[PDB]
Structures are given as C-alpha cells and as structure tokens.
Structure 1
Amino acid sequence: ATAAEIAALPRQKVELVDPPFVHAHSQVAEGGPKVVEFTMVIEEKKIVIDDAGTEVHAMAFNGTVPGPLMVVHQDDYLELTLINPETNTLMHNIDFHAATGALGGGGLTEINPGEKTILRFKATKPGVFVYHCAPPGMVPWHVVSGMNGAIMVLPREGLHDGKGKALTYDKIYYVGEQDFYVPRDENGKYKKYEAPGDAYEDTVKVMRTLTPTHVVFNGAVGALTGDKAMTAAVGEKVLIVHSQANRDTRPHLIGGHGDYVWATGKFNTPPDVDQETWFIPGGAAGAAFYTFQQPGIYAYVNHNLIEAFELGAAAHFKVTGEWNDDLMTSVLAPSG
C-alpha cells in the first residue's frame, strides 16, 4: 500500500483494559483494513509480588504487568502512541514481535522521560505475539521488570481449526507469565530499594543464575485467584492467550484440556489438539481454546509444579453449571 492508500483507511481508537481481560473486539473483521490506534503510558512503580511483601521495581506498560493485550486483524495497521512521563527515571521503547523492521520498532521508539512517540506497523501475520521493551544494553533488565505484554492479530475471518471450520470463542483471557529475580540479603530475606536503579546490580547477579525467585501470572503470586479468578460456564468456549517474554513455560488447565492449541501462537500453523500440557518458549505467546464440560474450580498452571506451587505460577477458574457423571463420577467416595 502507498502512503496515500494508508491515509485513506478508516481509523479506530481502542480503549485498552487491564489483563486478564481484553478490550472489545470482533473475531471476524468488521469491514476492510483499518489503522487501529492505541495509547499506553509507561509507569515505573513498585509492585508487591507475594504475601511476604516482596517488592519489584516494575516497569509497566499501561501501569500493569503484563501490559494489556492489543487486538487487531491481519493487514490492519497498529498505530501506538507510547508515552514516557517525566515522573519516570529511565528511557524505554517497544519491540513488537508482530512487526517487521527496526528491531520490531525498538529502534524507532526510544523515549526518555518527558517524551512520546507514535509507531505504525502493518500486522502482516496472524497470531498472538509478544511485545516488550528493549533498551540497548539493558534489554533483559526491563523485560524481567515486567515490561512486556502481547498482541493478537486475528485472521480477518476469525479463528479456524486445522480443517478450516470456524472456532468462535465466548470469552478470552490473557495470562502474562513473569519470571522475577529478587535479590536477598545474607539471612535470605528479600531486599527492598527506594529507586529502580538502586536494584540493578543486585538484580543482574540473580538474573545470571537463570533461576527466578518468583514465577507469576499477572504480576504476583495468587493474582488470578479469588477476586480475580477467571470465570466460565459449562458449554462456554474460552480462548486463553499466554505469553512469556523471557523464559519457557508449559501451560496446563487442571481438570481440563487445550482442545485446540496454537502452541507457537501463529494461526497459519495448524493447532495441536486434545492437549494436556502445551509448551511456549521464552520470547513467545501461545493460545489455547477449550470448551468447558464440568463445573467447579480449575487451576491453570505452568506444569513445572515447583514453578506453579512454590514459585507462584497458578491461576484459578470458577466454572458454573451442571456436573456430568458420564464424563466423571465418584463410584465410591473416600471411605474406610
């Protein structure tokens, strides 16, 4: 497309929402290609990541870890306004794995505190894709400070299975998984700091062990439980988008399955089916589609169970509806 052709396309402004929710969108594209406009303000802020009051100096797109999910369709343009307020201390940028050129956009979006930038790219490939900050020389530090999220580029005709039949979800959730590397003092207590730069040297030492202290969904142990448990009903079709910008993960829905899983996150690669546990490499997003068949509590985990249940990588679903005794029944309940 020429500059004039792009200038003539319709514009649509989207209001982002906090994960694990996803902003309003249509699965099947409404009309032809558009320039879809998003704005995010970067917030450097302390977050508390566990019940011991452990702190991270987060670097947070739109104020959350992960950053919010942006949804467009294939061959739309994504036009992001990125703002780094004067209240921040560091330069930031953005690299979209969905984009082509200039280090995913990072080379064109380096903004110091008090600056903003607008980047446009053509979403040429359908899938879920990571985005993350990547300042030269400080790349992993920003990413493991929570400065990452994902986008979804839907096919213009929505999702399909490997044989071209439509797959239409009722609900979508975005689970961003984060590895954190929190320094500890000689007595094993997590250290606190009063500026992001103060934590840098100590954090790099932990990073270099390749052993996270915490592995969490939505920025904290237990974040996607209780008041923030995900919900569904028996019969409901749910898409779970999952990202990890730095480290491998292996998602699993305890009591469920991934009926269709785009484990590589790319919709032109046919989905795996009937999955127990799928695998998403560090630096990628994946997506799983499931139709709930039983009510009750589910856990959704990284199935390194030490990572899930010692380090924090566990969420819950609460599912309403009627129990199916054909699928499962207790013939003899626990008894003497």
Structure 2
Amino acid sequence: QDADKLPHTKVTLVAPPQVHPHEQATKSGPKVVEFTMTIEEKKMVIDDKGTTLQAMTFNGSMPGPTLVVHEGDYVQLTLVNPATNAMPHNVDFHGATGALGGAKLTNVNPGEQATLRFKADRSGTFVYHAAPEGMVPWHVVSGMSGTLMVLPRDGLKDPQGKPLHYDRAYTIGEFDLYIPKGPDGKYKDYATLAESYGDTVQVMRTLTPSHIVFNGKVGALTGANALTAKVGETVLLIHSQANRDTRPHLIGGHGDWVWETGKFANPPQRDLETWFIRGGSAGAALYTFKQPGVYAYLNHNLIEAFELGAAGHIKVEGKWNDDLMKQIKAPAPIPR
C-alpha cells in the first residue's frame, strides 16, 4: 500500500518504564501511526551523592518513550526542539531505511520542528537516537535514545511458529555516562550544557564510564519505582543500549524466549541465563514468573551493575513453590 491512501491513527506516549497500550496480534490493516516528541535539555541528579548530568532527552525522560507499531505500518513522527534548548538535534531510527535513519530530514534548531514518515517494514525492537553532525556520540551518551518496537501483525512466535504472549511490557534504557571530574577529585557541576562539552569528550575517549544507569539514575527502578508482576504473568523486557554493550540477567529467573539481536523474524533462544545487547541495538526477552519475591534485573558485569549503577528490581507477588526451590536446612552451626 501507498501510505498516502492509508488510515491514520494517533498514539499518546507514556513515560518509561511503561509502554503505551497496544495490540500484539491484530486484525487491523496497515496504518500511518502518528507520534510527537519534544526535546528537553535539563540538568539531572544521577546518583545518591548529588552528582549531576547535563542531560539531553526525548520527552523529558531517559530513555525516550517506546513507540510501538506493527510491521507494514508507517511511523510518522513530529520532532519538536523548543527555543528554551541550546543545541540543534535530530533523530536516527534504526528501524527506517534511508537518509542516515532520518537524521538528514530532521535537523531542528531551537525554535523548530519537523515531521518524518517512514515504512516500518522489518519486525523487531530498534534503537532510535539523536545524531547531529559533528556531535553524535555526545547527544547519545547525554541521554538521547529510546526504542521503536515493530511487532509482527500476528504477534510474537517461538521457533516452531507457536504463538507467544505477554501480559505486561517494560522498557529499560541503559546509559553509559561520562561525567568529568576536576583536579579536586569531585564530579563537575556545570551551569550550562555547552560548558560541559569539551571535558565530557575527553572522558568519553577513555572508554570508561563514570556511571552506568538504567532509566536515568542509580536506583531508578528500585523502591517505590520497582517493576512489578505476579506469579503466572509473562513480562516482556525491552532493553536498549545505543552506545555500549550490555549483558542482561534476571537473578533467580531466566530469559524464557530471547531475541538478543532484537529482530522477531529470527527464532528466539530459550532458557538463557544472561543475554547480550550489542551497543547500538535493542533486544527483547520474555519471562513467566514462577516464584514470588524481589528479583534483580541487571547487567551481569557485576562491577557495572553494583558499583556503577546498572541494576533494577522487580517485585513479584504470589505463592512460593517448594518444588522449584526449597531450603532443606537453614543456616546453622557446622556439626563436629
């Protein structure tokens, strides 16, 4: 079909880690699916000792919201760069074909907006990210990425073609941050975004992040903001990393079905302990909970997880199953 002859629909985005309401399998034919995002540059507190980032975001969040369409839909995005921002921006969709992912067609200075349409002709989770000429890595590592999910029109399938469902989807964006320090050994705090640029590029070139965070801060997905589920529920965990490799793992769980390269026309792998998201990609895992409790979902470079920030929690309600795991003898003195 010709996109100019198709019906249009408008989607209201939601903030991560939620994903906007959508169908899995659908009876709908292809549509032009309209979205809007507004860029917001802002200073953000990223850890528990007051460190700040001169951040750059789509729609005020790290990651930007997840956009969901079905294969054969057209994505039509209006990208807005308000006059209160300092820098030019654009967007590169890995799900799109041509013009550097759309980056060449979406160059917006502060005070400007643009609208891009592209055919979502390949199923999968795909990164989108800013890519302004001459300062591409800086905008990405400062927060400008998220995920486009293009579902098969018949929903997700296992390697034999059997249907797979999820009850809840969550989106996790992992961000390798490069916060400079001064000669006093303290992280720098900058009054403006432009002031932070040359110091940050120097840290970037060391390839050693100061922090690695989920969803914008150490501990973002913990406490009141933990992910939630129940025994018997199947969750889809979408994981994006626009710049650097990561290795997701659910402590005390598994990836039941995982597309680590994130492309749903390929058969998934089952029973994974840890999977691998290549820098510059998004992947997806399904898991059905069988035990209650508080799980950790983390990057299994455990230094990156526990020392630098790349870890969250999932609080799961339900009945403990002693067939799967039982404490036979609690900790007690060693017999002599």
TM-score range normalised by the length of the shorter chain: over 0.9
2:40 is aligned, of 43, 47, 54, to: 43
Q: Does 1:142 align with 2:139?
A: yes
Aligned equivalents of 1:17, 1:58: Cα separation in 2? 20
Aligned equivalents of 1:33, 1:23: Cα separation in 2? 18
Q: Does 1:172 align with 2:173?
A: no
Unaligned runs of 5+ in 2: none
Deviations, residues 194-243 of structure 1 (Å, cap 9, x unaligned)? 11110000000100000000000001000000111000000000000000
Aligned equivalents of 1:139, 1:274: Cα separation in 2? 37
Q: Does 1:65 align with 2:35?
A: no
Q: 1:260 is matched with which residue?
A: 257
* TM alignment of 1:80-91, pairs within 5 A: 80-91=77-88
- How far residue 30 of structure 1 moved from its aligned partner, in angstroms, is 4.0
Q: 2:292 is matched with which residue?
A: 295
Q: 1:78 is matched with which residue?
A: 75
Aligned equivalents of 1:129, 1:98: Cα separation in 2? 6
TM-score (norm 2): 0.98
Matched residue SS, 2:196: helix
Aligned equivalents of 2:49, 2:98: Cα separation in 1? 43
* TM alignment of 1:239-258, pairs within 5 A: 239-258=236-255
- How far residue 27 of structure 1 moved from its aligned partner, in angstroms, is 0.6
- How far residue 29 of structure 1 moved from its aligned partner, in angstroms, is 2.4
> Which deviates more from structure 2 when the two are superposed, residues 316-325 or residues 27-36?
27-36
Q: Does 1:103 align with 2:90?
A: no
2:123 is aligned, of 110, 126, 129, to: 126
1:55 is aligned, of 52, 55, 64, to: 52
Aligned equivalents of 2:327, 2:96: Cα separation in 1? 51
Amino acid at match of 1:86: A
Aligned equivalents of 2:76, 2:26: Cα separation in 1? 17
Percent identity between matched residues is 66
Q: Does 1:158 align with 2:155?
A: yes
Aligned equivalents of 2:302, 2:240: Cα separation in 1? 18
Aligned equivalents of 2:255, 2:71: Cα separation in 1? 24
Aligned equivalents of 1:9, 1:87: Cα separation in 2? 36
Unaligned runs of 5+ in 1: none
* TM alignment of 1:28-39, pairs within 5 A: 28-39=25-36
Q: 2:302 is matched with which residue?
A: 305
Deviations, residues 272-331 of structure 1 (Å, cap 9, x unaligned)? 110000001100000000000000000000000000000000000000000000000000
Q: Does 1:275 align with 2:272?
A: yes
* TM alignment of 1:207-222, pairs within 5 A: 207-222=204-219
TM-score (norm 1): 0.98
Q: Does 1:223 align with 2:249?
A: no
Matched residue SS, 1:105: helix
Q: Which aligned segments of 4 or more residues in structure 1 are displaced greater than 6 angstroms? A: none
Deviations, residues 105-159 of structure 1 (Å, cap 9, x unaligned)? 0010000000000000000100000000000110000000000111100000010
Aligned equivalents of 1:200, 1:113: Cα separation in 2? 18
Q: 1:326 is matched with which residue?
A: 323
Deviations, residues 233-282 of structure 1 (Å, cap 9, x unaligned)? 00000000000000000000001000000000000111111000000110
- How far residue 187 of structure 1 moved from its aligned partner, in angstroms, is 2.4
- How far residue 8 of structure 1 moved from its aligned partner, in angstroms, is 2.3
Aligned equivalents of 2:71, 2:119: Cα separation in 1? 8
Aligned equivalents of 1:227, 1:35: Cα separation in 2? 37
Paired residue total: 333
Matched residue SS, 2:3: helix
Amino acid at match of 1:105: G
Amino acid at match of 1:179: D
Matched residue SS, 1:140: helix
Amino acid at match of 1:22: V
Instruction: Give the alignment's Cα RMSD to 1 decimal.
Output: 0.6
